[PDB]
Amino acid sequence: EAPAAVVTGAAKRIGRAIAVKLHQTGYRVVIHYHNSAEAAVSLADELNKERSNTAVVCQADLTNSNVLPASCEEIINSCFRAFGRCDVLVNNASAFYPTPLVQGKTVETQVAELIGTNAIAPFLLTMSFAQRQSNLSIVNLCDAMVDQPCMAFSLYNMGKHALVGLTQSAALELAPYGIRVNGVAPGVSLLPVAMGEEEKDKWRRKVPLGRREASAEQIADAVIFLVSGSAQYITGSIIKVDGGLSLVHA
Amino acid sequence: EAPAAVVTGAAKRIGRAIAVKLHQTGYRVVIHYHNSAEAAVSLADELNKERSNTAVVCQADLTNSNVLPASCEEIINSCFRAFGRCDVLVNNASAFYPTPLVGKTVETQVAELIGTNAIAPFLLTMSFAQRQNLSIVNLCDAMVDQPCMAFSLYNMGKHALVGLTQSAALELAPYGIRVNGVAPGVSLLPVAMGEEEKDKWRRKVPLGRREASAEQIADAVIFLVSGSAQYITGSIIKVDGGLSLVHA
Amino acid sequence: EAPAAVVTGAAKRIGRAIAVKLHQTGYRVVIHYHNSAEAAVSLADELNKERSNTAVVCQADLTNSNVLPASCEEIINSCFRAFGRCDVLVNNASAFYPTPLVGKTVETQVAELIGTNAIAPFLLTMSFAQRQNLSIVNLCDAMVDQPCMAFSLYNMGKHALVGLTQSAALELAPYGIRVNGVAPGVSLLPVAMGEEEKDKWRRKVPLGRREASAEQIADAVIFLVSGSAQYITGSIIKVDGGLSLVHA
Amino acid sequence: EAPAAVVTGAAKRIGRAIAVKLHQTGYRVVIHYHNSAEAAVSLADELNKERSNTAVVCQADLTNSNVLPASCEEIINSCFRAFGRCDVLVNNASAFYPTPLVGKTVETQVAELIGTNAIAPFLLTMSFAQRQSNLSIVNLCDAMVDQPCMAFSLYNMGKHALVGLTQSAALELAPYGIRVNGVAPGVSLLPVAMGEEEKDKWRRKVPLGRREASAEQIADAVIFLVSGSAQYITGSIIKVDGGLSLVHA
Ligand SMILES: NC(=O)c1ccc[n+]([C@@H]2O[C@H](COP(=O)([O-])OP(=O)(O)OC[C@H]3O[C@@H](n4cnc5c(N)ncnc54)[C@H](OP(=O)(O)O)[C@@H]3O)[C@@H](O)[C@H]2O)c1
Ligand SMILES: NC(=O)c1ccc[n+]([C@@H]2O[C@H](COP(=O)([O-])OP(=O)(O)OC[C@H]3O[C@@H](n4cnc5c(N)ncnc54)[C@H](OP(=O)(O)O)[C@@H]3O)[C@@H](O)[C@H]2O)c1
Ligand SMILES: NC(=O)c1ccc[n+]([C@@H]2O[C@H](COP(=O)([O-])OP(=O)(O)OC[C@H]3O[C@@H](n4cnc5c(N)ncnc54)[C@H](OP(=O)(O)O)[C@@H]3O)[C@@H](O)[C@H]2O)c1
Ligand SMILES: NC(=O)c1ccc[n+]([C@@H]2O[C@H](COP(=O)([O-])OP(=O)(O)OC[C@H]3O[C@@H](n4cnc5c(N)ncnc54)[C@H](OP(=O)(O)O)[C@@H]3O)[C@@H](O)[C@H]2O)c1
Ligand SMILES: Nc1nc2ccccc2[nH]1
Ligand SMILES: Nc1nc2ccccc2[nH]1
Ligand SMILES: Nc1nc2ccccc2[nH]1
């Protein structure tokens, strides 16, 4: 029987490459998505062409609210429903936008989205994953720039910091259960769709290793390692995949 | 004219010591409290006896909700209404209790632990800055990289607070606002905790085999807000007696 | 044809496991040794039995001295000599013993502890880069932030090695040379260590209450040198079963 | 009676600022120096003109060598010789120059960069503690240790090792009531060899006031850490960098 993984925000970009690589490695996959319905269904189609009944989609808002626990419970449930097991959780889904300290969304909405997706939803999915429980592990998508934050990204940066906190806290507490918890921290990888070309090239010029962003596949490569038998004694570790970017002074 | 500080959760323990030392240095103080009204008022009365019209209290629940931004606005506004200025903000109030992964709902715990330790400090920072030797001190935790077992949300909250400290330090530097942290290891221990358990923690501390007094924590806050720290921002000063350096 | 790796301190324990795993992956190997000649040649015999002329031995003291730079140049040279190329350097060799602050001279201990753990890696890094999927992997230590009591020089050495890892990752990136680290917590316990003290450490490990095998450490090295780590430089992977997360 | 302090490389710049501030606080000082004899004697004269017999100079090379432990022991002995006690040690002296990976020999650069930044602090710490109330050591570190200057590997290795020492010694000497802490400047006084344009390039990166720390600003954090207001602080390294370390590439 093939193992199963949940990847959140798996319709596009890094999430999608993680889903594709897990599937290539022999995993059945739940493709979680929020708005990207066509892309997710299309990904599941592609993967199911390769091996039938090895991919399903699961829709959910990971914004924080009083029903977020139910939503997170359901994403894990959906893996058991489809595949009868859940071996790997990848916490990939992420809101990323500036929240300036000095001056359409209300600040509480920005808190719910940025802290919910980057931190609370991973926490709740971690609970649900562990509650429903071999090579079990969780990989959180972190950020190599957490200590050199983007200007005016306080809420986002707080979310990612809390994610590091969860990574270590869950590694420690789930170790008795044989669930490993690790992170992968991209620096610059696939740049924002809305980011302009001049900005994209400014960030690219900053990376010591090859003056370019990471491919989604290079990030996924690190996830694959962490879920594998070659990482069986590794828990609580966050692997930077940043081409040295975090080492460059101002 | 005397400067003015807001200290959150200032009725008891570390918060109280901070407020008292701030007052002794010459600050007028806003004493924020949640449930400890009698203590906050008794403190205000003591400080106003020392020098009249130098202390006020302000009640607010700092749990996250749609009304938290208004609450945080109002705490900052109360410093201006009382004293005409707000020079220092100390983010001290904190919920601290276990939240194992395997009567409060989990979302109430999220609201309380993330709210007090991170969201409220962020909102108060926005309000403090929007209203402007200005500085913010956040009360962090020296043990964030070796967390208490089954305290994931508390740990997430304190990690988020480090994030805020760094982000705000960077963003507010142009306005001349410094943002720093004090990270206690073990200080004032719970009242009801058995002496034998307190002693388990005390014996772990390399420096003197004892916990920090609240005054010792307050001392580092005093340094950070003073003219002797005028180039210091985004720094978190551990006040832990070497505890975080001790391996399991 | 086949890429080539230098493994320092490769005759025994974690170094041997790294060399074996590199060889199994397709590398030709230089097995460096200081005192363990019988074991190094024994490893080479086994590897060469598998594939002819794919393993050579190299003797050098990696204690700092006036001749260390020449010794380091010659270890790198011996890889080019044997195999015509040098793709991977693994800095594994390491002196480990206490140096209380309160019969080797202290300067000998400095030479051995800082030399094996930091200066030689620096010199080998220099020679490796001078002679040029290229990478260096440094064997670091997950317990650098909570060090063993009375191990200041050793701890200073492993700290400098982190510094070298980062410095060299930055400076060598334009040459396409990646520089990374693997930080064991407790793996193969020292041969000198008593049995009850071994079990004391094992009991501390959250993931399995056991030390890492040498092979499990090697697995992380193998990942870092592979095409699966092509964007990774300046990274130090902890392989510690959660040990560094455990408060005192 | 007044406490005594040893400050290494104290003839000028930051080390001088630290010994002056320690002096103004009530300390008798040992002004350690290597090549800056004129400046050290000038400083001791000023401080002695302020309060008679409250400053002595002490010459020593802090380059690593087989005699370095004896030199470091002698720096500590000189404090006890002048003042009868030694309460505070500040490890400030520092060699700082590039060592690219690709007419000093490399082993001289090791000896100077690792010697001054790490080995001497370590030997001075041994001697300080061996010779032994508010006792402490302050190590002058570097806030940019994780975003190092390009081609400064040995310097960086030395400042990393100094962090290791701060933490190791803090742990080991806590039982003796010796606190061990650090102060980490980003950009403070720029090198005298730096032209104004390069200075300003660095100045413009500092979020807080777009300027370098004064020598006094660094000394302020040293003074705090040696004081009674820091009596529970050990193994801490206070960044005094105006937010520099927080700024991405
Ligand atoms: N790309 C980089 O350079 C970089 C750098 C540092 C860190 N990272 C981290 O690495 C991970 C992957 O990066 P990425 O750039 O691929 O991410 P991304 O495109 O910005 O976001 C990934 C997915 O997150 C989902 N998402 C956003 N808000 C959500 C919500 N409220 N509820 C549920 N899902 C939500 C979206 O799903 P739908 O499209 O289905 O709506 C989106 O496709 C993220 O955690 C990111 O923070 C990336
Ligand atoms: N004590 C330690 O050993 C230690 C260790 C590490 C870090 N710290 C940190 O240092 C700071 C001070 O510590 P402490 O032990 O003195 O604090 P504490 O007693 O645990 O809490 C301080 C105050 O926080 C306030 N608070 C709790 N929930 C609140 C809510 N929902 N809304 C508004 N206020 C709320 C309470 O005010 P009311 O009483 O008025 O309700 C409480 O008195 C805290 O940030 C703590 O996390 C302390
Ligand atoms: N074992 C662990 O639990 C653990 C924990 C944390 C970090 N680490 C790190 O992981 C790496 C491997 O650990 P290990 O326990 O396998 O190491 P080890 O057995 O203590 O040492 C490995 C080899 O280093 C060589 N070496 C020692 N002094 C030398 C000198 N002066 N010159 C040249 N070579 C010298 C020796 O080679 P010869 O036998 O040929 O003389 C020795 O066999 C080391 O870097 C270590 O610090 C290990
Ligand atoms: N200035 C900065 O922006 C900056 C930034 C980061 C960190 N720091 C750290 O803060 C401290 C003070 O900085 P600084 O710029 O004032 O220092 P510095 O001027 O570069 O050096 C201070 C003193 O170190 C002494 N020194 C150098 N080599 C020596 C040797 N081989 N033996 C004995 N003494 C030697 C010199 O003494 P003599 O003149 O008597 O020969 C020199 O005056 C240093 O540890 C530095 O690394 C400074
Ligand atoms: N999450 C995230 N962090 C980023 C930093 C730089 C560019 C794109 C990014 N996306
Ligand atoms: N180098 C090194 N560091 C160690 C820590 C614990 C046990 C064995 C070890 N070997
Ligand atoms: N020691 C030291 N570190 C420095 C970093 C930037 C500019 C000058 C410096 N001097």
UniProtKB/TrEMBL annotation, chains B, C:
Residues annotated as carrying Cysteine sulfenic acid (-SOH) in the record are: 58, 72, 148
Read off the InterPro entries from this record: NAD(P)-bd_dom_sf, Pteridine_reductase, Sc_DH/Rdtase_CS, SDR_fam
| Residues annotated as signal peptide | none
One GO molecular function term of this record is:
nucleotide binding
UniProt: substrate binding residues:
135
UniProtKB keywords: Nucleotide-binding, Oxidoreductase
Q: According to its UniProt record, which residues of this chain constitute the active site?
A: 141 (proton donor/acceptor), 154 (proton donor/acceptor), 154 (proton acceptor)
Q: Which Pfam families match?
A: adh_short_C2 (PF13561)
Q: For binding NADP(+), which residues are annotated in this chain's numbering?
A: 12-14, 34-36, 61-63, 92, 94, 154, 158, 185, 187-188
Q: Which domain of life is it from?
A: Eukaryota
UniProt cross-references to PANTHER family, sorted A to Z = OXIDOREDUCTASE, SHORT-CHAIN DEHYDROGENASE/REDUCTASE FAMILY (AFU_ORTHOLOGUE AFUA_5G02870), SHORT-CHAIN DEHYDROGENASE_REDUCTASE FAMILY PROTEIN
Please state what the protein is called.
Pteridine reductase
The source organism is: Trypanosoma brucei brucei
Gene designation? PTR1
